[PDB]
PDB file of C-alpha atoms in Angstrom:
ATOM      1  CA  UNK A  11      -1.065 -59.573 -13.332  1.00 48.38           C
ATOM      2  CA  UNK A  12       1.003 -58.381 -10.368  1.00 46.42           C
ATOM      3  CA  UNK A  13      -0.803 -58.480  -7.023  1.00 46.14           C
ATOM      4  CA  UNK A  14      -0.731 -55.334  -4.899  1.00 46.11           C
ATOM      5  CA  UNK A  15       0.184 -55.291  -1.208  1.00 46.89           C
ATOM      6  CA  UNK A  16      -3.486 -54.699  -0.368  1.00 47.81           C
ATOM      7  CA  UNK A  17      -4.449 -57.722  -2.487  1.00 51.43           C
ATOM      8  CA  UNK A  18      -5.953 -55.924  -5.497  1.00 54.45           C
ATOM      9  CA  UNK A  19      -4.541 -57.126  -8.841  1.00 54.26           C
ATOM     10  CA  UNK A  20      -3.202 -54.530 -11.247  1.00 50.22           C
ATOM     11  CA  UNK A  21      -1.001 -54.135 -14.329  1.00 49.29           C
ATOM     12  CA  UNK A  22       2.645 -53.105 -14.013  1.00 47.98           C
ATOM     13  CA  UNK A  23       4.096 -50.554 -16.445  1.00 45.82           C
ATOM     14  CA  UNK A  24       7.845 -49.949 -16.583  1.00 48.35           C
ATOM     15  CA  UNK A  25       7.596 -46.429 -18.051  1.00 45.46           C
ATOM     16  CA  UNK A  26       7.490 -43.536 -15.606  1.00 47.30           C
ATOM     17  CA  UNK A  27       4.249 -41.664 -15.033  1.00 47.56           C
ATOM     18  CA  UNK A  28       6.100 -38.391 -15.647  1.00 49.46           C
ATOM     19  CA  UNK A  29       7.429 -39.510 -19.044  1.00 50.38           C
ATOM     20  CA  UNK A  30       4.004 -39.051 -20.685  1.00 50.57           C
ATOM     21  CA  UNK A  31       3.844 -36.331 -23.325  1.00 53.80           C
ATOM     22  CA  UNK A  32       0.760 -34.741 -21.744  1.00 53.64           C
ATOM     23  CA  UNK A  33       2.498 -34.641 -18.346  1.00 55.62           C
ATOM     24  CA  UNK A  34       5.658 -33.089 -19.833  1.00 54.73           C
ATOM     25  CA  UNK A  35       4.111 -29.614 -19.753  1.00 55.88           C
ATOM     26  CA  UNK A  36       3.510 -29.586 -15.992  1.00 54.82           C
ATOM     27  CA  UNK A  37       6.943 -31.072 -15.262  1.00 56.98           C
ATOM     28  CA  UNK A  38       8.701 -27.834 -16.252  1.00 55.89           C
ATOM     29  CA  UNK A  39       8.107 -25.302 -13.483  1.00 53.27           C
ATOM     30  CA  UNK A  40       9.521 -21.922 -12.500  1.00 51.74           C
ATOM     31  CA  UNK A  41      10.675 -21.913  -8.876  1.00 54.20           C
ATOM     32  CA  UNK A  42       9.085 -18.770  -7.469  1.00 50.65           C
ATOM     33  CA  UNK A  43      10.509 -17.190  -4.310  1.00 52.00           C
ATOM     34  CA  UNK A  44       7.732 -16.122  -1.896  1.00 52.12           C
ATOM     35  CA  UNK A  45      10.258 -15.190   0.823  1.00 55.02           C
ATOM     36  CA  UNK A  46      10.798 -11.694  -0.633  1.00 52.48           C
ATOM     37  CA  UNK A  47       8.891  -9.257   1.560  1.00 54.78           C
ATOM     38  CA  UNK A  48       7.323 -11.763   3.941  1.00 57.56           C
ATOM     39  CA  UNK A  49       4.237 -10.580   5.812  1.00 59.31           C
ATOM     40  CA  UNK A  50       2.565 -12.408   8.725  1.00 57.54           C
ATOM     41  CA  UNK A  51      -0.753 -12.230   6.866  1.00 54.20           C
ATOM     42  CA  UNK A  52       0.972 -13.630   3.775  1.00 52.78           C
ATOM     43  CA  UNK A  53       2.503 -16.503   5.741  1.00 53.27           C
ATOM     44  CA  UNK A  54      -0.834 -17.232   7.420  1.00 54.04           C
ATOM     45  CA  UNK A  55      -2.560 -17.294   4.031  1.00 51.05           C
ATOM     46  CA  UNK A  56       0.102 -19.650   2.643  1.00 47.53           C
ATOM     47  CA  UNK A  57      -0.298 -22.019   5.596  1.00 46.17           C
ATOM     48  CA  UNK A  58      -4.095 -21.896   5.309  1.00 48.58           C
ATOM     49  CA  UNK A  59      -3.911 -22.716   1.599  1.00 46.22           C
ATOM     50  CA  UNK A  60      -1.503 -25.577   2.311  1.00 47.41           C
ATOM     51  CA  UNK A  61      -3.971 -26.939   4.871  1.00 48.19           C
ATOM     52  CA  UNK A  62      -6.646 -27.339   2.194  1.00 47.26           C
ATOM     53  CA  UNK A  63      -4.258 -29.078  -0.214  1.00 47.64           C
ATOM     54  CA  UNK A  64      -2.254 -26.450  -2.079  1.00 45.31           C
ATOM     55  CA  UNK A  65       1.211 -27.603  -0.906  1.00 44.74           C
ATOM     56  CA  UNK A  66       2.985 -25.373  -3.472  1.00 44.71           C
ATOM     57  CA  UNK A  67       3.545 -22.005  -1.780  1.00 40.89           C
ATOM     58  CA  UNK A  68       4.466 -23.789   1.443  1.00 41.42           C
ATOM     59  CA  UNK A  69       7.024 -25.912  -0.420  1.00 42.35           C
ATOM     60  CA  UNK A  70       8.607 -22.867  -2.067  1.00 42.28           C
ATOM     61  CA  UNK A  71       8.665 -21.020   1.266  1.00 42.77           C
ATOM     62  CA  UNK A  72      10.360 -23.971   2.960  1.00 48.62           C
ATOM     63  CA  UNK A  73      12.944 -24.125   0.159  1.00 49.97           C
ATOM     64  CA  UNK A  74      13.646 -20.412   0.589  1.00 51.38           C
ATOM     65  CA  UNK A  75      13.965 -20.787   4.367  1.00 54.92           C
ATOM     66  CA  UNK A  76      16.355 -23.737   4.152  1.00 54.19           C
ATOM     67  CA  UNK A  77      18.783 -21.625   2.084  1.00 54.84           C
ATOM     68  CA  UNK A  78      18.311 -18.094   3.461  1.00 55.65           C
ATOM     69  CA  UNK A  79      18.674 -18.994   7.157  1.00 57.27           C
ATOM     70  CA  UNK A  80      22.153 -20.207   8.095  1.00 57.68           C
ATOM     71  CA  UNK A  81      21.218 -21.617  11.512  1.00 57.32           C
ATOM     72  CA  UNK A  82      18.241 -23.565  10.163  1.00 58.53           C
TER      73      UNK A  82
ATOM     74  CA  UNK B  11     -10.848  48.309   0.099  1.00 60.28           C
ATOM     75  CA  UNK B  12      -7.358  47.720  -1.281  1.00 61.68           C
ATOM     76  CA  UNK B  13      -8.407  48.888  -4.757  1.00 59.76           C
ATOM     77  CA  UNK B  14      -9.819  52.109  -3.309  1.00 65.35           C
ATOM     78  CA  UNK B  15      -6.573  52.626  -1.413  1.00 62.60           C
ATOM     79  CA  UNK B  16      -4.647  52.066  -4.656  1.00 63.10           C
ATOM     80  CA  UNK B  17      -6.789  54.649  -6.461  1.00 62.54           C
ATOM     81  CA  UNK B  18      -6.284  57.239  -3.695  1.00 62.78           C
ATOM     82  CA  UNK B  19      -2.517  57.399  -4.091  1.00 62.98           C
ATOM     83  CA  UNK B  20      -2.170  61.150  -4.691  1.00 65.26           C
ATOM     84  CA  UNK B  21      -3.323  61.926  -1.137  1.00 62.23           C
ATOM     85  CA  UNK B  22      -4.578  59.250   1.274  1.00 57.80           C
ATOM     86  CA  UNK B  23      -6.685  60.143   4.279  1.00 59.23           C
ATOM     87  CA  UNK B  24      -6.136  58.730   7.763  1.00 59.08           C
ATOM     88  CA  UNK B  25      -9.149  56.403   7.678  1.00 62.58           C
ATOM     89  CA  UNK B  26      -8.303  54.996   4.235  1.00 63.76           C
ATOM     90  CA  UNK B  27      -4.722  54.226   5.270  1.00 62.58           C
ATOM     91  CA  UNK B  28      -5.930  52.680   8.535  1.00 60.29           C
ATOM     92  CA  UNK B  29      -8.425  50.465   6.691  1.00 60.35           C
ATOM     93  CA  UNK B  30      -5.763  49.372   4.200  1.00 60.18           C
ATOM     94  CA  UNK B  31      -3.371  48.546   7.041  1.00 59.25           C
ATOM     95  CA  UNK B  32      -6.073  46.531   8.803  1.00 59.49           C
ATOM     96  CA  UNK B  33      -6.826  44.669   5.566  1.00 60.84           C
ATOM     97  CA  UNK B  34      -3.176  43.783   4.955  1.00 61.01           C
ATOM     98  CA  UNK B  35      -2.803  42.696   8.594  1.00 60.16           C
ATOM     99  CA  UNK B  36      -5.821  40.412   8.167  1.00 60.08           C
ATOM    100  CA  UNK B  37      -4.299  39.040   4.952  1.00 62.94           C
ATOM    101  CA  UNK B  38      -1.013  38.286   6.713  1.00 60.61           C
ATOM    102  CA  UNK B  39      -2.938  36.583   9.519  1.00 60.45           C
ATOM    103  CA  UNK B  40      -4.741  34.454   6.917  1.00 55.09           C
ATOM    104  CA  UNK B  41      -1.432  33.577   5.237  1.00 57.09           C
ATOM    105  CA  UNK B  42       0.135  32.549   8.559  1.00 58.28           C
ATOM    106  CA  UNK B  43      -2.879  30.339   9.291  1.00 56.93           C
ATOM    107  CA  UNK B  44      -3.929  32.265  12.408  1.00 59.40           C
ATOM    108  CA  UNK B  45      -7.421  32.924  11.024  1.00 57.17           C
ATOM    109  CA  UNK B  46      -9.763  31.270   8.537  1.00 57.34           C
ATOM    110  CA  UNK B  47     -10.834  33.216   5.414  1.00 59.82           C
ATOM    111  CA  UNK B  48     -14.369  31.865   5.838  1.00 57.97           C
ATOM    112  CA  UNK B  49     -16.946  30.311   3.543  1.00 58.23           C
ATOM    113  CA  UNK B  50     -19.450  31.730   1.085  1.00 59.93           C
ATOM    114  CA  UNK B  51     -22.794  32.575   2.670  1.00 60.63           C
ATOM    115  CA  UNK B  52     -24.902  30.856  -0.008  1.00 65.09           C
ATOM    116  CA  UNK B  53     -23.609  27.395   0.959  1.00 65.13           C
ATOM    117  CA  UNK B  54     -21.041  26.132   3.453  1.00 62.67           C
ATOM    118  CA  UNK B  55     -17.971  25.432   1.314  1.00 62.99           C
ATOM    119  CA  UNK B  56     -14.297  26.190   1.883  1.00 61.55           C
ATOM    120  CA  UNK B  57     -11.816  26.610  -0.981  1.00 62.05           C
ATOM    121  CA  UNK B  58      -9.681  23.596  -1.827  1.00 61.75           C
ATOM    122  CA  UNK B  59      -6.002  23.594  -0.933  1.00 63.86           C
ATOM    123  CA  UNK B  60      -2.895  21.464  -1.178  1.00 65.22           C
ATOM    124  CA  UNK B  61      -1.598  19.262   1.641  1.00 64.09           C
ATOM    125  CA  UNK B  62       0.229  21.531   4.081  1.00 64.46           C
ATOM    126  CA  UNK B  63       1.550  18.550   6.078  1.00 65.00           C
ATOM    127  CA  UNK B  64       2.746  15.329   4.462  1.00 64.03           C
ATOM    128  CA  UNK B  65       4.871  12.437   5.726  1.00 63.01           C
ATOM    129  CA  UNK B  66       6.229   9.332   4.028  1.00 65.45           C
ATOM    130  CA  UNK B  67       7.120   5.883   5.328  1.00 66.47           C
ATOM    131  CA  UNK B  68       7.404   2.294   4.154  1.00 61.09           C
ATOM    132  CA  UNK B  69       4.487  -0.129   4.677  1.00 62.91           C
ATOM    133  CA  UNK B  70       4.005  -1.059   8.366  1.00 62.49           C
ATOM    134  CA  UNK B  71       4.670  -4.775   8.746  1.00 61.29           C
ATOM    135  CA  UNK B  72       4.282  -6.302  12.234  1.00 58.65           C
ATOM    136  CA  UNK B  73       1.464  -3.876  13.048  1.00 61.04           C
ATOM    137  CA  UNK B  74      -1.457  -4.802  15.282  1.00 61.89           C
ATOM    138  CA  UNK B  75      -3.715  -4.843  12.210  1.00 60.63           C
ATOM    139  CA  UNK B  76      -1.868  -7.912  10.893  1.00 61.37           C
ATOM    140  CA  UNK B  77      -3.790 -10.437  13.041  1.00 65.38           C
ATOM    141  CA  UNK B  78      -1.786 -13.242  11.455  1.00 69.33           C
ATOM    142  CA  UNK B  79       0.184 -14.368  14.494  1.00 66.80           C
TER     143      UNK B  79
END
């Protein structure tokens, strides 16, 4: 068994975690664009949700900002 | 009043014509909005009417009700 950096032994698997058949469904995603009609309440709600561990709407919003804004 | 004036078309008296003129003047005042027709005496209730004044605008972003910034 391969020893982890923390010192806890484990088993090494060469196959990716995303290659599992059950995980294949969640791999395909539709990239929504929440930057259409932005509202300060909407942005605040997205940030609040990302604080608790959502991390999805914030990621899509950041992707939209990095392409819509030329200076950024 | 106006029906009685309509009936007395062959020869109208001075008072009947004066009353009809006063009635039509009151009706024009009501139409122009310068006076209220009133409400029925049995219970306080005014007749329903359409919106005389109406404006349209897009939703107000950046208003002080946002409280998000």
